[PDB]
């Protein structure tokens, strides 16, 4: 038996019609790993700035930055 057909459901149907469709092999996993390591480096940068383990020129890292 079929489901309930609605105009909006028909409009949105192609966006939920490709479940289980995958690429063979590893796909873009290497690019994803590169993005993940870059994001880890970025998070480490901001953590070390806000920990004052990384000191930069114009980054006061205090309430005086509100000035």
């Amino acid at each position: 038996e079929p489901g309930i057909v609605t105009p909006l459901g028909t409009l949105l149907r192609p966006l939920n019609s490709e479940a289980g469709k995958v690429l063979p092999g590893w796909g873009t996993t290497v690019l994803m790993a590169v993005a993940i390591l870059l994001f880890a480096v970025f998070l480490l940068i901001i953590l070390e700035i806000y920990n004052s383990s990384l000191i930069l020129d114009g980054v006061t890292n205090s309430w005086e930055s509100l000035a």
């Binding site: 480096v41 940068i45 070390e48 383990s53 990384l54 000191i55 930069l56 020129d57």
Partner: peptide
């Protein structure tokens, strides 16, 4: 430009890449 803290941070990133390569080589050394 580059503070001593920034230089040490970049060198620490290099050292982390080096030690990850080293543990990969230790894995493949079996």
């Amino acid at each position: 430009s580059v503070t001593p803290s920034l230089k040490n941070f970049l060198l620490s990133l290099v050292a982390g890449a080096v030690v990850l390569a080293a543990i990969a080589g230790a894995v493949t050394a079996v």
